[PDB]
Design a binder for this molecule. Structure first.
Ligand SMILES: [Cl-]
Ligand SMILES: [Cl-]
Ligand SMILES: [Cl-]
Ligand SMILES: [Cl-]
Ligand SMILES: [Cl-]
Ligand SMILES: [Cl-]
Ligand SMILES: [Cl-]
Ligand SMILES: [Cl-]
Ligand code: NA
Length: 129
């Protein structure tokens, strides 16, 4: 599924991401924009052989199992395929664990490079929330 901006903002809020670990909703929408362009089916292979999955590009090195990432963990206890669903529940639940891991949203390199410090409220501007 390719979400619209406000559509995703609404789904993220419904799933309790808004201000989760102190990160306002626009941070989450901004991260999804640059990680996946709001596409739940996005997958991208990393140089190290791991793969990033879904709207928030969650990495198989640590968070989900894809059966082809040697030495990796599965800390969200889910198949990486669950992170590609039209329903964002699994991605949200796993993202909550990631953002609680110690480094906040810096875990998402695209968030650090493209969203951190910027006017992230623009991402939810105009949305019925
Ligand atoms: Cl957009
Ligand atoms: Cl915001
Ligand atoms: Cl694996
Ligand atoms: Cl393969
Ligand atoms: Cl594990
Ligand atoms: Cl699995
Ligand atoms: Cl959803
Ligand atoms: Cl933080
Ligand atoms: Na893994």
């Amino acid at each position: 599924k390719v979400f619209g901006r406000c559509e995703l903002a609404a789904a993220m809020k419904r799933h309790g991401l808004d201000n989760y670990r102190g990160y306002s909703l626009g941070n989450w929408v901004c991260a999804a924009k640059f990680e996946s362009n709001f596409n739940t089916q996005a997958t991208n292979r990393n140089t190290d052989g791991s793969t990033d999955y879904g709207i928030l590009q969650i990495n198989s090195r640590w968070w989900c199992n894809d059966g082809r990432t040697p030495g990796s963990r599965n800390l969200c206890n889910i198949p990486c395929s669950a992170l590609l669903s039209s329903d964002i529940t699994a991605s949200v639940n796993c993202a909550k664990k990631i953002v609680s891991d110690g480094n906040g949203m810096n875990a998402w390199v695209a968030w650090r490079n493209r969203c951190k410090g910027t006017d992230v409220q623009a991402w939810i501007r105009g949305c019925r929330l």
